[PDB]
Design a binder for this molecule. Structure first.
Ligand SMILES: [Ca+2]
Ligand SMILES: [Ca+2]
Ligand SMILES: [Ca+2]
Lengths: 97, 262, 49, 692, 89
């Protein structure tokens, strides 16, 4: 019973990226190679994140929602569409070399 | 594209100047042909007749409403008043720099500032800007998004405002749109076309909202004065130096506007 | 390998639509909340003219 | 690689159960309806929600029986109450033993001038009654909730019985008798799921509802209001029973950049919290049962419509979004009509409405149905608290239902919305200003696809994202397409065969070849054909090498789906299932074992030959079964006949023969590019066999 | 409700005898997946729920899931802790 508690402002994304980049110093090559060999999946990637945030409103779902709209997803879609068009005997353009 | 030169090789009348001055200067001069006299003196210095255009503004605040600089080289004689340091700094920041501005529709959308180079420039007869920061869930912080009386006031009946709010937080604005227009402007760099001559007190123009820097560019000049005739004789006699301080615009292109060119 | 995370985040994105449908329909059919009373009775004065 | 789409669609089908559960929760009631007299259509439940004490309904056969319904508030002793029943005022002695459940009683008169009788007790907290007239009997509900059963009465002339009714009503077909029972014994669903939202009389005669994108962005002002149901209880008047939000509607007009836009809106709130103030049990203590307040956990939906081109171009929407401002709803003061003593007042309580999405809906009126847009707003309580004077409920937060409008005519939310509607334009002009054969077309498309590019597509893995990320659909359709395809894929023939294979293997874990395995369960022709038909599932099980017949099939399916202009979202699932189950019916599989190749087809053609010289050897069915049980099986994209023809007419190198036997995509594309007629013909036959 | 589970343990331990080794290896080769594992169950009595989700709800909390999370966290920390250098046995 109280007025709505405003969620705290998060951070400036520019400085967040700056700090994230600065974290690259604390990286060991051999251990990073081991971590790269380990196949991170929907479970392993997010299991140890955010400690034990109560709500955890499907952090995987949030990542997927913001990821399928990323430039990488669009590039994959464009590649698949181009391959389908080529397979469909698309009328090749005048300057499509 | 790349421009390759050489560090050993020895490499061995078509422009317009605009002088912007306050009304009181002409009022004190009190000679109906003073502009013609200055034209002839500029001619002696090497400026063909008609190459110099004289523009009269009434006040710094009034001139600050959409400054219209339409010469190849512009010199603004700005008088100093100790109660107008921020106004002079805002006008200098507006004209001495180049801004890429886009329209802002405060009554519909919320807005934020992307980075240190982006600000909100408001101009008009009377700009009374109030702001309310918002959080991720679109609730005001220290203000109620619906009651504009609680908003935080950053301007008051200003002819020109260059407002800078915390970056990366949405804001709701209550700028009086009837007598003011506010635009989202990103500073590109320096406008070499225009130089400012502060005819008055100390050097106080802070053309960088950054508190750690108050750079004094070569185009920000200052002169002590007691007679406008002496001020104008100084400008005419040292026109060569002022032009050497200035440079031609490098801006590729922007909205079309009137210019006074040859 | 570790790229499996990106590949899976792309492949499984179709569940985002299920999550959105869950959210909207749950909002539409959120049942009323009952404010259970405390153990203490709320007795007050009697109607007095 | 491209066959991965079938494996993913079959693997991820478990989410179809989640989707179906959500849709079942989604499973519409027709109503409410104004208090009027009408003949109840047969086969339909009539649900009734009363609001004030009195006679809920009165209907009679006018021949031998006159029935009615009476509602009495709880906490009433044995008193003689008067009621206007059948247009005749009569007094009946009734008591209400219950203290917190309303009593519904059916009233029966077997003769016009007889004596009334009371029957069918009902103790209902949600205040809902039900009636039917079918199967030559009248159905009415009885029994304390939730243990409410149906009682049957015999009143002749069942199909020609008219009711006179006095509350809100809903119509629910016979088949939804279970839903009717659940609603009566547990309460109505939230009002947003109602057809009429508001009564809207009984005129339910209204009707509900290449492509080019058209944008219709507009600025709107949603003006809405709240409505209340303050249902005072019985007794001396010292206690109430309900103060609840009801849907409200409002018609207004405003300027929208030149055009006078006349709009209609309806506001309804969901998710409120039922506060209560039980002052005790004395007859003269201030007792309240359920006052509902909206807080952060409650939403408010406003359906908005206007007489504009934009809103008559809303049938098909490809994108919809709004950025409305936020508004403040403050509560008024409701003075209770306390018979004696100071008057309690429900003063205060504020909330803030902020936009939280927008979706299509359908408002209704007494004459027409509107294709409106539903704006859903999340709530946020604010500084003005609501108190209940002359009590101990002070410093509570939220907006109560006492006087949500606070005397204001309307609440206004100004903003903008942007929609991209699809219009069926068959020409470069004529943009409209308002809104077997498929199999044959799909088969016809097969004649205009390039084989080398098809092989490229088949090498490309098609996952869930890639397969369906390139098809653009309406706002409602694009949301659920993977779910739709999986819903039928998990029931197709291929899924059934996968399940049967897994069950056979599991049962065997607790004989054509040497060992008895579920994989190998003219005699040689028959045996090899059966084994190959089972081997078709090796591709799904991912126990192959090189390309796959289902890789080619998936590539062709994707290409044809992209090409087609006559495929609807509701048609894609069927087409995908049919392609998975039918494309390339004739499949051949080979096993290589130390310089020996055994190839067998579904059609009963079996070959055995040497890798080096492609010279036929007597086929050994037992050895073939033993090898195919576990050793990898290579799809014979280039079958033995084509391989021998190619070797005879062309000098296949050792590496080329090895790769062709192993189904190397590289070598296959190499030969296609070289334009080898034999291999091109073989791939063309494979493609053309992809029929529906 | 673990008494039923215990009876199930006793039932399952008695099915070890009734296993064929070659067919078991064939089944092991067959890639059981989210569909194959639960598709052919005995009868799917009235209104079978989301069995896959019901299984995963406890699978993601079993000890094996905790071990996987621990391994991932250990590898991440090892990749993160240049500073520790030689602070792992
Ligand atoms: Ca404030
Ligand atoms: Ca100013
Ligand atoms: Ca800023």
């Amino acid at each position: 019973n109280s007025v709505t508690v405003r969620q705290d402002l998060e951070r400036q994304l520019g400085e967040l990226r700056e700090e994230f980049n600065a974290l690259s110093q604390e990286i060991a090559m051999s251990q990073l190679i081991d971590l790269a060999l380990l196949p991170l999946d929907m479970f392993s990637m997010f299991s140890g994140i955010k400690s034990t945030i109560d709500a955890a409103k499907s952090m995987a779902t949030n990542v997927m929602k913001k990821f399928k709209k990323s430039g990488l997803a669009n590039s994959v879609s464009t590649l698949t569409d181009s391959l389908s068009d080529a397979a469909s005997s698309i009328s090749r353009g005048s300057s499509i070399r | 594209l790349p421009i390759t030169g050489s560090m050993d090789i020895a490499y061995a009348l078509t422009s317009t100047l605009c002088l912007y001055y306050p009304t009181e200067a002409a009022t004190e001069i009190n000679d109906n042909s003073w502009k013609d006299t200055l034209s002839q003196l500029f001619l002696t210095k090497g400026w063909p007749t008609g190459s110099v255009y004289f523009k009269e503004y009434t006040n710094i605040a009034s001139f600050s409403v959409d400054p219209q600089l339409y010469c190849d080289y512009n010199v603004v004689l700005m008088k100093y008043d100790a109660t107008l340091q921020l106004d002079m700094s805002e006008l200098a920041d507006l004209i001495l720099n180049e801004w890429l501005c886009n329209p802002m529709d405060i009554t519909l959308y919320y807005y934020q500032q992307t980075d240190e180079a982006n600000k909100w420039i408001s101009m008009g007869s009377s700009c009374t800007i109030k702001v309310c920061p918002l959080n991720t869930q679109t609730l005001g912080i220290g203000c109620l998004t619906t009651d504009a009386t609680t908003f935080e006031e950053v301007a008051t009946a200003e002819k020109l405002v260059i407002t800078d709010v915390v970056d990366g937080v949405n804001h709701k604005l209550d700028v009086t749109t009837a007598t003011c227009t506010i635009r989202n402007c990103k500073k590109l760099g320096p406008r070499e076309n225009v130089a400012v001559i502060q005819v008055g007190g100390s050097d106080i123009l802070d053309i960088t909202a950054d508190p750690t820097t108050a750079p004094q560019t070569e185009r920000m000049m200052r002169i002590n004065w007691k007679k406008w005739w002496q001020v104008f004789y100084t400008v005419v006699d040292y026109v060569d130096q002022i032009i050497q301080v200035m440079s031609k615009r490098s801006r590729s292109l922007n909205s079309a506007a009137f210019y006074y060119r040859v | 390998m570790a790229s499996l995370i990106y590949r899976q985040l792309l492949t499984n994105s179709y569940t985002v639509d299920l999550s959105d449908e869950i959210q909207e329909i749950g909002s539409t059919k959120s049942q009323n909340v009952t404010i259970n009373p405390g153990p203490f009775a709320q007795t007050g004065y009697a109607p007095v003219n | 690689m491209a066959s991965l789409i079938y494996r993913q669609l079959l693997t991820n089908s478990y989410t179809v159960d989640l989707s179906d559960e959500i849709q079942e929760i989604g499973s519409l009631l027709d109503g409410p309806y104004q208090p009027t007299t009408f003949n109840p259509p047969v086969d339909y439940w009539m649900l009734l929600a009363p609001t004030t004490p009195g006679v809920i309904v009165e209907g009679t056969n006018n021949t031998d029986r006159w029935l009615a319904t009476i509602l009495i508030e709880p906490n009433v002793q044995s008193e003689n109450r008067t009621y206007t029943i059948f247009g005749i005022q009569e007094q009946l002695t009734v008591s209400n033993t219950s203290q917190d459940q309303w009593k519904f009683i059916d009233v029966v008169k077997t003769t016009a001038n007889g004596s009334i009788g009371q029957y069918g007790p009902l103790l209902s907290s949600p205040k809902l009654y039900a009636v039917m007239k079918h199967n030559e009997k009248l159905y009415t509900y009885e029994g304390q909730t939730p243990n409410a059963t149906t009682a049957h009465y015999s009143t002749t002339n069942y199909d020609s019985v008219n009711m006179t009714a006095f509350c809100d009503f809903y119509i629910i077909p016979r088949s939804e008798e279970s839903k009717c029972t659940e609603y009566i014994n547990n309460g109505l669903p939230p009002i947003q799921n109602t057809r009429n939202v508001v009564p809207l009389s009984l005129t339910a005669r209204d009707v509900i509802h290449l492509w080019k994108e058209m944008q219709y962005n507009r600025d709107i002002t949603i003006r809405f209001k709240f409505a209340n149901t303050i249902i005072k209880s019985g007794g001396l008047g010292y206690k109430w029973s309900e103060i609840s939000f009801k849907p409200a509607n409002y018609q207004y007009t405003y300027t929208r950049d030149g055009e006078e836009v006349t709009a209609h809106t309806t506001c309804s709130v969901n998710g409120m919290n039922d506060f209560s103030f039980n002052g005790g049990y004395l007859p003269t203590d201030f007792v309240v049962s359920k006052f509902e307040v909206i807080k952060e956990n409650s939403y408010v939906y406003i359906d908005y419509w206007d007489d504009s081109q934009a809103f008559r171009n809303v049938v098909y929407v490809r994108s919809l979004a709004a950025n409305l401002n936020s508004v403040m709803c403050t509560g008024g003061s409701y003075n209770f009509s306390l018979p004696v003593g100071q008057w309690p007042v429900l003063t205060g309580g504020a909330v803030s409405l902020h936009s939280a999405g927008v979706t299509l809906s359908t408002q209704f009126t007494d004459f027409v149905s509107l294709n409106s847009l539903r704006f859903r707003f999340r709530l946020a309580v604010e500084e003005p608290h609501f108190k209940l004077t002359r009590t101990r409920l002070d410093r509570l937060y939220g907006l109560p239902a006492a006087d949500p409008n606070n005397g204001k005519e309307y609440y206004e939310i100004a903003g903008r919305f942007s929609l991209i509607s699809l219009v069926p334009s068959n020409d470069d002009y004529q943009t409209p200003i308002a809104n077997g054969e498929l199999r044959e077309e799909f088969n016809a498309l097969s004649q205009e696809i390039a084989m080398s590019q098809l092989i490229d597509l088949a090498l490309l893995p098609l996952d869930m994202f890639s397969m369906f990320s390139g098809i653009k659909s309406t706002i409602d359709a694009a949301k659920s397409m993977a779910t739709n395809v999986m819903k039928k894929f998990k029931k197709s023939g291929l899924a059934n065969s996968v399940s049967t294979l897994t069950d056979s293997l599991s049962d065997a874990a607790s004989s054509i070849g040497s060992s008895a395995s579920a994989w190998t369960d003219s005699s040689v022709s028959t045996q090899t054909s059966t084994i190959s038909r089972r081997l078709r599932l090796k591709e799904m099980a991912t126990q192959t090498e090189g390309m796959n017949f289902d890789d080619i099939s998936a590539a062709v399916l994707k290409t044809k789906i992209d090409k087609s202009t006559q495929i609807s979202p509701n048609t894609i699932p069927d087409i995908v299932t049919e392609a998975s189950e039918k494309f390339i019916p004739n499949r051949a599989y080979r096993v290589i074992n130390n310089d020996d190749v055994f190839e067998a087809g579904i059609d009963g053609k079996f070959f055995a030959y040497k890798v080096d010289t492609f010279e036929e050897i007597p086929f050994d069915v037992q050895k073939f079964a033993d090898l195919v049980t576990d050793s990898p099986v290579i799809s014979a994209i280039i079958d033995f006949k084509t391989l021998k023809n190619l070797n005879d007419n062309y000098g296949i190198s050792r590496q080329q023969a090895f790769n062709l036997l192993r189904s190397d995509p590289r070598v296959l594309r190499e030969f296609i590019n070289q334009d080898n007629p034999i291999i091109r013909n073989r791939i063309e036959q494979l493609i053309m066999q992809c029929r529906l």
